[PDB]
Coordinates of C-alpha atoms and ligand atoms in Angstrom, one line a residue:
Chain A
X152 CA -46.7 -10.1 0.1
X153 CA -44.7 -7.6 2.7
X154 CA -43.8 -4.8 0.6
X155 CA -40.1 -3.3 1.0
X156 CA -38.1 -1.8 -1.8
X157 CA -34.2 -1.8 -1.0
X158 CA -31.9 0.2 -3.4
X159 CA -28.5 -1.9 -4.3
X160 CA -25.4 -0.8 -3.1
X161 CA -23.1 1.4 -4.6
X162 CA -20.4 -1.2 -4.3
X163 CA -22.0 -3.5 -6.7
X164 CA -21.3 -1.3 -9.3
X165 CA -17.4 -1.9 -8.4
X166 CA -17.1 -5.1 -7.6
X167 CA -18.9 -6.1 -11.3
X168 CA -18.9 -2.8 -12.7
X169 CA -22.9 -4.0 -13.2
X170 CA -26.0 -2.8 -11.4
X171 CA -28.4 -5.7 -10.1
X172 CA -31.9 -4.7 -8.7
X173 CA -33.7 -6.1 -5.8
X174 CA -36.7 -6.0 -4.2
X175 CA -36.9 -6.7 -0.6
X176 CA -39.8 -8.8 -0.4
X177 CA -40.2 -11.4 2.7
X178 CA -42.2 -14.1 2.9
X179 CA -44.2 -13.9 0.0
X180 CA -47.3 -17.3 -0.6
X181 CA -45.6 -20.2 -3.2
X182 CA -47.1 -19.6 -6.7
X183 CA -46.3 -21.0 -10.1
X184 CA -45.3 -18.3 -12.9
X185 CA -45.1 -15.6 -10.7
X186 CA -44.7 -12.2 -12.2
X187 CA -43.1 -8.2 -10.4
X188 CA -43.6 -5.0 -11.6
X189 CA -40.4 -2.5 -11.0
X190 CA -40.9 1.2 -13.0
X191 CA -38.8 3.7 -13.4
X192 CA -40.2 7.4 -13.4
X193 CA -40.7 5.7 -17.1
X194 CA -42.6 3.3 -16.5
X195 CA -40.6 0.5 -18.3
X196 CA -41.5 -3.2 -16.9
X197 CA -38.8 -5.1 -15.7
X198 CA -36.4 -8.6 -16.4
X199 CA -38.1 -11.5 -15.2
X200 CA -36.6 -13.1 -11.9
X201 CA -33.2 -14.9 -12.4
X202 CA -32.1 -18.0 -10.0
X203 CA -34.3 -18.1 -7.8
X204 CA -35.9 -20.7 -5.1
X205 CA -39.3 -22.1 -7.3
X206 CA -39.7 -24.3 -3.1
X207 CA -38.4 -22.9 -0.2
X208 CA -38.6 -25.6 2.8
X209 CA -39.6 -22.2 5.0
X210 CA -41.8 -20.9 2.6
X211 CA -39.4 -17.5 2.2
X212 CA -40.4 -16.7 -1.2
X213 CA -38.5 -13.5 -1.3
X214 CA -39.6 -11.7 -5.0
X215 CA -36.7 -10.4 -6.9
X216 CA -36.1 -7.6 -9.9
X217 CA -34.0 -8.5 -11.4
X218 CA -32.3 -6.1 -13.9
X219 CA -29.3 -4.8 -15.2
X220 CA -29.7 -0.9 -16.4
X221 CA -27.2 2.0 -16.8
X222 CA -25.9 3.8 -13.2
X223 CA -27.0 7.1 -14.7
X224 CA -30.8 5.6 -14.8
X225 CA -30.2 5.0 -10.9
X226 CA -27.6 8.1 -10.4
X227 CA -30.6 10.3 -11.9
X228 CA -33.2 10.1 -8.7
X229 CA -35.6 8.5 -10.3
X230 CA -39.2 6.9 -8.1
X231 CA -38.6 3.6 -8.3
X232 CA -42.3 1.5 -7.5
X233 CA -41.7 -1.7 -6.7
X234 CA -45.1 -2.9 -7.7
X235 CA -46.0 -5.9 -6.7
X236 CA -48.1 -8.2 -8.4
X237 CA -50.3 -11.1 -7.1
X238 CA -53.5 -12.9 -7.1
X239 CA -53.9 -12.5 -3.7
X240 CA -53.5 -8.5 -3.9
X241 CA -56.1 -7.0 -5.7
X242 CA -54.7 -3.9 -5.7
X243 CA -51.0 -3.6 -5.4
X244 CA -49.0 -1.9 -3.1
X245 CA -46.5 1.3 -4.4
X246 CA -42.9 1.5 -1.8
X247 CA -40.2 4.1 -3.0
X248 CA -36.8 4.3 -2.4
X249 CA -34.8 7.6 -3.8
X250 CA -30.7 8.8 -2.8
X251 CA -30.9 12.8 -2.6
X256 CA -20.0 15.6 -0.9
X257 CA -16.4 15.4 0.6
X258 CA -13.7 12.7 -0.8
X259 CA -12.8 9.6 1.8
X260 CA -10.0 10.4 4.3
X261 CA -8.1 7.1 3.4
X262 CA -5.0 6.2 5.8
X263 CA -3.2 2.5 6.0
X264 CA -2.5 2.3 9.5
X265 CA 0.9 0.0 10.9
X266 CA 0.2 -2.8 13.6
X267 CA 1.2 -2.3 17.2
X268 CA 4.5 -3.8 18.0
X269 CA 2.7 -5.5 21.2
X270 CA 0.8 -8.1 18.9
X271 CA 4.2 -8.4 17.0
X272 CA 5.8 -9.2 20.6
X273 CA 3.0 -11.8 21.3
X274 CA 3.3 -13.7 17.9
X275 CA 0.3 -15.0 17.9
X276 CA -1.1 -13.2 14.2
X277 CA -0.8 -9.4 12.8
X278 CA -3.6 -7.1 12.2
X279 CA -3.2 -4.3 10.0
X280 CA -6.5 -1.1 9.4
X281 CA -7.6 0.7 7.5
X282 CA -9.3 3.5 8.2
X283 CA -12.0 5.0 6.2
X284 CA -12.8 9.0 7.2
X285 CA -14.3 12.1 6.1
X286 CA -16.7 10.5 3.0
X287 CA -20.4 11.8 3.6
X288 CA -22.2 8.6 1.3
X289 CA -23.2 5.8 3.5
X290 CA -21.5 2.8 1.6
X291 CA -18.3 1.9 1.2
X292 CA -16.4 -1.1 -0.4
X293 CA -12.7 -1.8 0.9
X294 CA -10.3 -4.5 -0.9
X295 CA -7.1 -5.7 0.4
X296 CA -4.0 -6.6 -1.9
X297 CA -0.8 -8.0 -2.1
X298 CA 1.2 -7.2 -5.9
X299 CA -2.0 -7.9 -7.4
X300 CA -3.4 -11.4 -5.9
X301 CA -7.0 -11.3 -5.3
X302 CA -8.3 -13.5 -1.8
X303 CA -10.8 -14.7 0.1
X304 CA -13.8 -12.7 1.0
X305 CA -14.2 -13.9 5.2
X306 CA -10.0 -13.5 5.5
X307 CA -11.2 -9.1 5.3
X308 CA -14.4 -8.4 7.1
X309 CA -15.3 -4.7 6.7
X310 CA -17.7 -2.4 9.0
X311 CA -21.8 -1.1 8.8
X312 CA -21.2 2.5 8.4
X313 CA -21.2 5.5 11.3
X314 CA -21.7 9.4 11.9
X315 CA -19.1 10.8 12.3
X316 CA -18.9 12.2 16.1
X317 CA -16.9 15.5 15.1
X318 CA -19.5 15.8 11.7
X319 CA -23.0 14.1 11.5
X320 CA -23.0 14.5 8.1
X321 CA -19.6 12.8 7.9
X322 CA -19.0 9.0 8.1
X323 CA -16.4 6.6 8.7
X324 CA -15.3 2.7 8.1
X325 CA -12.9 0.5 9.5
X326 CA -11.5 -2.3 7.3
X327 CA -8.8 -4.8 8.5
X328 CA -7.0 -7.4 7.1
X329 CA -5.9 -9.9 9.9
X330 CA -2.7 -11.8 8.9
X331 CA 0.0 -14.1 10.1
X332 CA 3.2 -12.0 12.3
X333 CA 5.6 -13.5 9.6
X334 CA 4.3 -12.8 6.1
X335 CA 4.4 -9.2 8.0
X336 CA 7.9 -8.9 9.6
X337 CA 9.5 -10.5 6.2
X338 CA 8.8 -7.7 4.1
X339 CA 5.7 -8.5 2.0
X340 CA 3.4 -5.9 0.6
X341 CA 0.4 -4.6 1.3
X342 CA -1.9 -2.6 -0.2
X343 CA -5.3 -0.8 0.4
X344 CA -7.7 0.3 -1.9
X345 CA -11.0 2.3 -1.8
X346 CA -14.1 2.3 -4.2
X347 CA -16.1 5.7 -3.1
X348 CA -17.8 7.9 -5.1
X349 CA -16.7 11.6 -4.3
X350 CA -13.2 11.5 -5.8
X351 CA -11.5 12.6 -8.7
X352 CA -9.8 9.8 -9.8
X353 CA -11.4 5.9 -9.5
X354 CA -10.0 4.3 -7.0
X355 CA -7.0 5.5 -4.5
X356 CA -4.0 2.8 -4.0
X357 CA -2.3 2.7 -0.5
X358 CA 0.4 1.0 0.7
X359 CA 2.4 0.4 4.0
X360 CA 5.6 -1.9 4.8
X361 CA 8.0 -2.8 7.3
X362 CA 10.5 -0.5 5.4
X363 CA 8.0 2.5 5.2
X364 CA 6.5 2.1 8.5
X365 CA 7.9 3.7 11.9
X366 CA 12.4 4.3 11.4
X367 CA 14.2 4.2 14.5
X368 CA 17.5 5.0 12.9
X369 CA 18.5 8.4 11.0
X370 CA 22.1 8.7 9.5
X371 CA 21.5 11.5 7.5
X372 CA 24.7 12.2 4.9
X373 CA 25.1 15.7 4.6
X374 CA 28.6 16.5 2.2
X375 CA 30.1 19.4 2.8
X376 CA 31.9 19.8 -0.8
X377 CA 32.7 22.8 -3.3
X378 CA 32.6 20.3 -5.9
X379 CA 28.6 21.0 -7.1
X380 CA 26.4 20.4 -9.8
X381 CA 27.4 16.7 -10.0
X382 CA 25.1 13.7 -8.6
Chain B
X3 CA 19.0 -4.8 -0.5
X4 CA 18.1 -0.8 -0.5
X5 CA 15.2 0.8 -1.8
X6 CA 15.0 4.0 -2.9
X7 CA 11.5 5.9 -2.0
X8 CA 11.9 9.2 -3.8
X9 CA 15.0 11.5 -5.3
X10 CA 14.6 14.6 -6.2
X11 CA 17.6 15.3 -9.4
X12 CA 18.4 18.9 -8.9
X13 CA 17.9 18.7 -5.1
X14 CA 19.8 15.8 -4.7
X15 CA 17.8 14.3 -1.7
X16 CA 18.7 10.4 -2.4
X17 CA 15.8 9.0 0.2
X18 CA 15.8 5.0 0.8
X19 CA 15.1 3.0 3.5
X20 CA 16.5 -0.8 4.4
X21 CA 15.5 -3.5 7.0
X22 CA 18.7 -4.2 8.9
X23 CA 18.4 -8.1 9.7
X24 CA 19.7 -9.2 13.1
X25 CA 19.2 -13.0 14.8
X26 CA 16.1 -14.5 14.2
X27 CA 13.4 -13.9 17.2
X28 CA 10.6 -11.3 17.9
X29 CA 11.0 -8.8 15.9
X30 CA 13.5 -6.0 16.8
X31 CA 14.4 -5.1 13.5
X32 CA 15.7 -1.2 13.2
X33 CA 14.4 0.3 10.6
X34 CA 16.3 2.9 8.6
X35 CA 15.5 5.6 6.4
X36 CA 18.8 6.9 4.8
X37 CA 19.3 9.9 2.5
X38 CA 21.8 11.6 1.3
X39 CA 22.4 15.5 0.7
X40 CA 24.8 17.2 -1.3
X41 CA 24.7 20.7 -0.2
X42 CA 26.2 22.9 -3.5
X43 CA 28.1 25.4 -1.0
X44 CA 28.5 27.8 -3.8
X45 CA 24.8 27.8 -6.2
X46 CA 22.3 31.4 -6.2
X47 CA 18.6 31.8 -5.5
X48 CA 18.9 30.9 -9.6
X49 CA 20.9 28.2 -10.0
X50 CA 21.0 30.0 -13.7
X51 CA 20.9 33.6 -13.2
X52 CA 23.8 34.9 -12.2
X53 CA 23.0 38.1 -11.1
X54 CA 21.5 36.4 -7.6
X55 CA 24.1 36.8 -4.4
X56 CA 25.2 34.1 -3.0
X57 CA 22.7 32.1 -1.4
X58 CA 23.0 31.0 2.7
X59 CA 19.6 29.7 3.6
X60 CA 19.3 25.8 2.9
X61 CA 16.0 24.5 3.1
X62 CA 15.0 20.7 2.9
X63 CA 11.0 19.4 3.1
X64 CA 11.5 15.8 3.1
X65 CA 7.5 15.4 2.6
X66 CA 7.5 18.6 -0.4
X67 CA 10.0 16.3 -2.3
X68 CA 8.9 13.2 -1.6
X69 CA 5.4 14.3 -3.3
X98 CA 10.2 25.9 -7.3
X99 CA 13.4 26.3 -6.9
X100 CA 16.6 23.9 -6.0
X101 CA 20.0 23.8 -5.2
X102 CA 21.8 21.3 -7.6
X103 CA 22.5 21.7 -11.3
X104 CA 21.2 18.5 -13.1
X105 CA 23.6 16.7 -15.8
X106 CA 20.4 15.8 -17.9
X107 CA 18.5 18.6 -18.7
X108 CA 19.7 22.4 -19.8
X109 CA 20.3 25.2 -17.9
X110 CA 20.2 28.0 -20.3
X111 CA 19.8 31.9 -19.5
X112 CA 19.8 34.8 -21.3
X113 CA 23.3 36.8 -21.3
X114 CA 24.4 40.1 -23.3
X115 CA 27.4 40.5 -25.4
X116 CA 28.0 43.5 -27.8
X117 CA 30.6 43.8 -30.1
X118 CA 30.9 47.6 -30.6
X119 CA 28.0 49.7 -31.1
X120 CA 25.3 47.1 -31.7
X121 CA 23.7 44.9 -29.1
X122 CA 23.3 41.5 -30.1
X123 CA 21.2 39.3 -27.5
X124 CA 23.0 35.8 -27.3
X125 CA 22.1 32.7 -25.5
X126 CA 24.9 30.6 -23.3
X127 CA 25.5 27.4 -21.2
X128 CA 25.6 27.9 -17.0
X129 CA 27.6 24.8 -16.8
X130 CA 30.3 22.9 -18.9
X131 CA 29.5 18.8 -20.5
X132 CA 25.7 18.9 -19.2
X133 CA 23.9 19.0 -22.1
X134 CA 26.2 19.5 -24.7
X135 CA 25.2 18.8 -28.6
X136 CA 26.1 15.3 -30.0
Chain C
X275 CA -5.6 19.3 11.7
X276 CA -6.4 16.8 14.0
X277 CA -5.3 13.6 15.1
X278 CA -7.2 10.7 15.1
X279 CA -6.9 7.9 17.8
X280 CA -8.0 4.7 17.3
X281 CA -8.0 1.2 20.2
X282 CA -7.3 -2.4 19.1
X283 CA -8.3 -5.1 20.8
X284 CA -9.8 -8.6 19.9
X285 CA -10.6 -12.0 21.5
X286 CA -14.2 -11.5 22.8
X287 CA -15.9 -15.1 23.8
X288 CA -19.0 -13.9 25.8
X289 CA -19.1 -11.1 22.7
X290 CA -19.9 -7.7 25.6
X291 CA -17.4 -4.8 25.8
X292 CA -17.5 -0.9 26.8
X293 CA -14.7 0.7 25.5
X294 CA -14.0 4.4 28.1
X295 CA -11.4 6.3 27.5
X296 CA -10.0 9.3 29.7
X297 CA -7.5 11.9 30.0
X298 CA -4.9 12.4 33.5
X299 CA -8.0 9.6 34.8
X300 CA -11.0 12.1 34.3
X301 CA -13.6 10.3 32.0
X302 CA -15.0 12.0 29.0
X303 CA -18.0 12.7 27.1
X304 CA -19.7 10.2 25.6
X305 CA -20.2 12.0 22.2
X306 CA -16.2 12.2 21.8
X307 CA -15.4 8.8 21.4
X308 CA -17.5 6.3 20.1
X309 CA -17.1 2.3 20.0
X310 CA -18.0 0.1 17.5
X311 CA -20.3 -2.9 17.6
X312 CA -18.7 -6.5 18.4
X313 CA -18.4 -8.6 14.7
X314 CA -16.8 -12.3 14.0
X315 CA -13.7 -12.9 14.1
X316 CA -11.6 -14.5 10.2
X317 CA -9.0 -16.8 13.2
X318 CA -12.3 -18.2 15.6
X319 CA -15.8 -17.9 15.1
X320 CA -15.9 -17.4 19.1
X321 CA -13.1 -14.4 19.3
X322 CA -14.8 -10.8 18.6
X323 CA -13.0 -7.9 17.4
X324 CA -14.5 -3.9 18.6
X325 CA -12.9 -0.3 17.9
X326 CA -12.8 2.3 19.7
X327 CA -12.5 6.0 17.4
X328 CA -11.8 9.0 19.4
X329 CA -11.2 12.4 17.4
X330 CA -9.1 15.1 19.0
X331 CA -7.0 18.1 17.8
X332 CA -2.9 17.0 16.7
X333 CA -2.2 20.3 19.1
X334 CA -3.5 18.4 21.9
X335 CA -1.6 15.2 20.4
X336 CA 1.3 17.3 20.7
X337 CA 1.3 17.6 24.5
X338 CA 1.7 14.5 25.0
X339 CA -1.5 13.3 27.3
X340 CA -2.0 9.8 29.3
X341 CA -4.8 8.9 26.3
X342 CA -5.1 5.7 27.6
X343 CA -8.0 3.7 25.7
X344 CA -9.8 1.4 28.8
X345 CA -11.6 -1.9 27.6
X346 CA -13.5 -3.3 30.3
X347 CA -14.6 -7.4 29.8
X348 CA -15.6 -10.3 31.6
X349 CA -12.8 -12.3 30.7
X350 CA -10.2 -10.0 31.5
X351 CA -9.0 -11.3 35.4
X352 CA -9.3 -7.2 36.6
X353 CA -12.5 -6.3 34.4
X354 CA -10.8 -3.8 32.6
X355 CA -7.7 -3.3 30.3
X356 CA -6.1 -0.1 29.2
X357 CA -2.6 1.0 27.4
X358 CA -0.5 4.5 27.5
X359 CA 0.1 6.1 24.3
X360 CA 2.4 9.4 23.9
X361 CA 4.5 11.0 22.0
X362 CA 7.6 9.1 22.4
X363 CA 5.6 5.5 23.6
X364 CA 7.2 3.2 20.4
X365 CA 10.7 3.2 20.0
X366 CA 13.3 5.0 21.9
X367 CA 14.0 6.5 18.5
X368 CA 18.4 6.3 18.0
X369 CA 19.4 9.3 15.4
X370 CA 22.3 8.1 13.4
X371 CA 22.9 11.9 12.1
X372 CA 25.6 13.1 10.9
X373 CA 27.2 15.7 8.9
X374 CA 30.4 15.2 6.2
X375 CA 32.7 18.8 5.0
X376 CA 34.3 16.6 2.8
Chain D
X330 CA 38.0 47.4 -10.3
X331 CA 38.2 50.0 -7.2
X332 CA 38.1 47.8 -3.4
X333 CA 34.7 49.3 -2.3
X334 CA 33.5 47.9 -5.2
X335 CA 33.8 44.4 -4.2
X336 CA 33.1 45.1 -0.7
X337 CA 29.6 44.0 -0.5
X338 CA 30.6 42.8 -3.7
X339 CA 28.4 43.0 -6.8
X340 CA 28.5 39.4 -9.5
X341 CA 31.3 40.1 -11.6
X342 CA 31.0 37.7 -15.1
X343 CA 33.5 36.6 -17.7
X344 CA 31.8 35.7 -20.9
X345 CA 34.0 34.3 -23.9
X346 CA 33.1 33.1 -27.6
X347 CA 34.9 30.8 -29.5
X348 CA 33.9 28.1 -31.3
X349 CA 34.4 24.6 -29.2
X350 CA 32.0 25.7 -26.7
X351 CA 28.8 23.6 -27.1
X352 CA 25.9 27.0 -27.1
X353 CA 29.1 29.5 -28.1
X354 CA 29.2 31.3 -25.1
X355 CA 30.2 30.7 -21.0
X356 CA 30.0 32.3 -18.2
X357 CA 31.6 32.5 -15.0
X358 CA 30.2 34.5 -12.3
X359 CA 32.7 35.6 -9.0
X360 CA 32.1 37.5 -6.0
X361 CA 33.1 38.2 -2.5
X362 CA 31.3 35.2 -1.6
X363 CA 31.8 32.5 -3.6
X364 CA 35.7 33.2 -4.9
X365 CA 38.4 31.4 -2.0
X366 CA 35.9 33.1 0.7
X367 CA 37.5 34.1 4.2
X368 CA 34.0 32.3 5.5
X369 CA 31.2 30.1 4.4
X370 CA 27.9 31.5 5.9
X371 CA 25.2 29.1 5.7
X372 CA 21.9 27.9 7.4
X373 CA 20.9 24.7 6.9
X374 CA 16.8 23.3 8.0
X375 CA 15.2 20.3 7.6
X376 CA 11.5 20.0 8.3
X377 CA 8.8 17.3 8.7
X378 CA 12.2 14.2 9.0
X379 CA 9.3 12.4 9.4
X380 CA 8.3 12.0 6.3
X381 CA 5.1 11.1 4.2
Chain E
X330 CA 12.8 -10.2 39.1
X331 CA 16.4 -11.3 38.0
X332 CA 18.9 -8.8 35.6
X333 CA 18.3 -11.0 32.6
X334 CA 14.6 -10.8 33.0
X335 CA 14.9 -7.7 33.1
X336 CA 16.8 -7.5 29.7
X337 CA 14.3 -9.4 28.1
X338 CA 12.5 -6.8 27.9
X339 CA 8.9 -8.1 29.2
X340 CA 5.8 -5.9 30.4
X341 CA 5.9 -6.0 34.2
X342 CA 2.7 -4.4 34.5
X343 CA 1.1 -3.0 37.6
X344 CA -2.3 -3.7 38.6
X345 CA -4.0 -0.9 41.3
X346 CA -7.4 -1.5 42.8
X347 CA -9.4 0.9 44.5
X348 CA -12.8 2.2 45.1
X349 CA -12.3 5.7 43.9
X350 CA -10.5 4.8 40.9
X351 CA -13.1 4.9 37.7
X352 CA -13.3 1.7 37.0
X353 CA -12.6 0.9 40.9
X354 CA -8.8 -1.1 39.5
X355 CA -6.1 0.5 37.2
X356 CA -3.2 -0.2 35.4
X357 CA 0.4 0.7 34.2
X358 CA 3.3 -1.0 32.3
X359 CA 7.3 0.0 33.1
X360 CA 10.1 -1.6 30.7
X361 CA 13.3 -0.8 30.0
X362 CA 12.5 1.5 26.9
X363 CA 9.6 3.3 29.3
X364 CA 11.8 6.1 29.7
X365 CA 14.9 6.4 26.6
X366 CA 15.1 9.3 25.4
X367 CA 16.2 9.9 22.4
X368 CA 19.6 9.2 21.5
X369 CA 21.1 12.2 18.6
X370 CA 25.0 11.3 18.1
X371 CA 26.9 13.9 15.3
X372 CA 29.5 12.9 13.1
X373 CA 32.3 15.4 11.4
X374 CA 34.3 13.5 8.5
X375 CA 36.4 15.8 6.3
Ligands
LIG401 C1 14.6 34.3 -10.7 O1 14.3 33.0 -10.4 C2 13.0 33.5 -11.1 C3 12.2 32.1 -11.0 O2 10.3 32.7 -11.3 C4 12.9 33.0 -12.7 O3 11.8 34.6 -13.4 C5 12.3 34.0 -14.4 O4 11.9 32.6 -14.8 C6 11.3 31.5 -16.1 C7 11.5 30.4 -15.3 O5 12.6 30.3 -17.5 C8 11.4 32.6 -16.8 O6 11.1 32.1 -18.2 C9 11.4 33.9 -17.0 O7 11.5 34.7 -17.8 C10 12.1 34.3 -16.0 N1 11.0 35.9 -15.6 C11 12.2 37.3 -15.9 C12 11.6 38.5 -16.2 O8 13.1 36.9 -16.1 C13 14.6 34.0 -12.7 O9 15.0 32.6 -13.4 C14 15.3 35.1 -12.2 N2 14.2 36.1 -12.0 C15 14.7 37.4 -13.1 C16 13.6 38.3 -12.5 O10 15.7 37.0 -13.3
NAG402 C1 22.9 3.9 7.0 O1 24.1 3.0 8.2 C2 24.1 1.6 7.5 C3 24.2 0.8 8.2 O2 23.0 0.1 9.2 C4 24.1 2.3 5.4 O3 23.6 0.5 5.0 C5 23.6 3.2 5.1 O4 23.8 3.0 3.8 C6 23.5 4.2 5.7 N1 23.3 5.1 4.9 C7 23.9 6.5 4.4 C8 23.3 7.3 3.7 O5 25.0 6.2 4.6
NAG403 C1 25.4 6.0 17.3 O1 24.1 5.5 18.6 C2 24.3 4.4 16.9 C3 23.5 3.0 18.4 O2 24.0 2.8 19.4 C4 25.2 3.8 17.3 O3 25.5 2.0 16.7 C5 26.9 4.5 16.2 O4 27.3 3.5 15.8 C6 26.4 5.7 17.0 N1 27.5 7.0 16.2 C7 28.8 7.4 16.1 C8 29.4 8.2 15.1 O5 29.1 6.8 17.1
NAG404 C1 24.0 3.9 12.7 O1 24.6 2.8 12.8 C2 24.6 1.5 12.7 C3 24.5 0.3 14.0 O2 23.5 -0.4 13.5 C4 26.1 1.8 13.1 O3 27.0 -0.4 12.1 C5 26.8 2.2 12.3 O4 27.8 2.9 11.7 C6 26.2 4.2 11.9 N1 26.2 4.9 10.9 C7 27.4 6.0 10.7 C8 27.9 6.1 12.0 O5 27.8 6.6 9.6
NAG405 C1 25.4 34.3 7.8 O1 24.0 33.4 8.0 C2 23.0 34.6 9.5 C3 21.8 33.2 9.0 O2 21.3 32.9 7.9 C4 22.2 35.6 8.9 O3 21.6 36.3 10.3 C5 24.1 36.7 9.3 O4 23.3 38.2 8.5 C6 24.5 36.1 8.2 N1 26.0 37.4 7.9 C7 26.4 37.5 6.3 C8 27.7 39.1 7.3 O5 26.3 37.2 5.3

């Protein structure tokens, strides 16, 4: 019978191109055919719970108001009241959640040489800074091949020391040293708002890393306009 | 295996790269960025307008061309400047080609 | 505008690390450098990883300071470990520069 | 042309018209520093060799 | 250390401990490339 409203992450509308509403209710008493109301400013009802656990060994029956709505409705800033209708509560309580702009500063950093000297593995980081919305998702992709979710992990949002409004996040795809030094392509992409395009593709390689040698070849020839 | 990062045709920069491979060991391979710039030594501030004098300054910003005026002529696109040709008392305004064999009609 | 320095460190089985930054042996204020919380590593659940991000002006980077990242941990034999970054801390960067006049 | 005209030389052009030209008109330009120059005064600057 | 061991470019970190130090102990690293300023060789081919 706990009352709390949690908003779906903006990364959900980029991962699956859909929005899944959820109300944060913990340890609600198990009752047969429970009803849940998730009303917006229009007052329309919510679609019933899908893929829920009716019986819980720990009695943690979360009341989830799962529904699929357009992102425009939530982006409009409508008040979302989670009316937890139940037999125990005669008058359900109301909880409200709402959201009140700089482009992400994303660059890809090559791994250190000491890690390659150790030969155990290689760690590459993708610095995502200068973004005002809290949530941010970073996906790792090698030549169009998706990976396991657990191989790369993203960081929790933290306030930027220089600008309190801006936030920073670090994402890593830790890999092996052989895959790094054989020249395999690594690409970093970010799914964040306040951007001209939907996503920005950034990549770094050993060839496009720190270069040690430079033979510039400037030919002082009278012949011109040929190359 | 030489990869071409960028190539500005009318600047003739040709920024390339290759990873040279030594014997198999902890990583000591030398990463190199290889460019080949052809200075004209006879072109002007406009390669199309003959009136401008000889240009001494040779500016090559690598980042500017990795992502306006340039020095080297192109073989594909045409460089046409308006030129006066006079027969008698009157004059007729006519086109011209700065360089030959580049984009002649076919 | 500025130079951003990140400090990579992994392998925390006790899972208790503090990262400090100093300039020429003088410790800096905690406002400039911030340390991320430890999180599990995909290879080994026992080993964790932590990060520190320092925001400093690019002109200070061009001066060539020590910019040491002191990482303190229980498993370290001396309980601290720092590394020094510089303008030429990587390769010697030998130049193959050539000029043709044919 | 006079010698003082060649000193600090202006752009002298040779414009000729013929049937066999592609655009029917071609142009060649000479001055002091192009046609058989005494010296090749060039300034060659490279900036941001690191690149992006 | 042996000359070949120095040629291998090992870390050779020197660590020193004292009470006046901020962390009571500090580290430094010396290699073959701890100096090594950038080598510029120029070619003039016609
Ligand atoms: C020298 O370069 C300038 C660069 O702006 C040129 O001036 C214009 O160039 C465009 C490019 O095709 C032409 O469409 C315009 O007609 C040019 N302006 C004029 C007034 O002709 C031009 O090549 C040179 N400048 C001048 C003054 O001739
Ligand atoms: C630079 O040297 C390499 C040999 O290591 C060569 O393959 C490359 O072509 C050179 N660069 C240029 C522009 O000639
Ligand atoms: C420049 O230095 C490198 C490094 O040893 C060398 O391989 C190269 O041949 C040198 N250039 C010339 C022209 O000797
Ligand atoms: C560049 O250095 C390489 C060494 O790997 C050398 O073989 C080559 O001749 C150099 N390029 C020159 C001298 O143009
Ligand atoms: C030659 O070039 C230099 C540098 O660009 C310039 O200072 C000087 O005035 C030039 N001299 C002539 C005669 O063009």
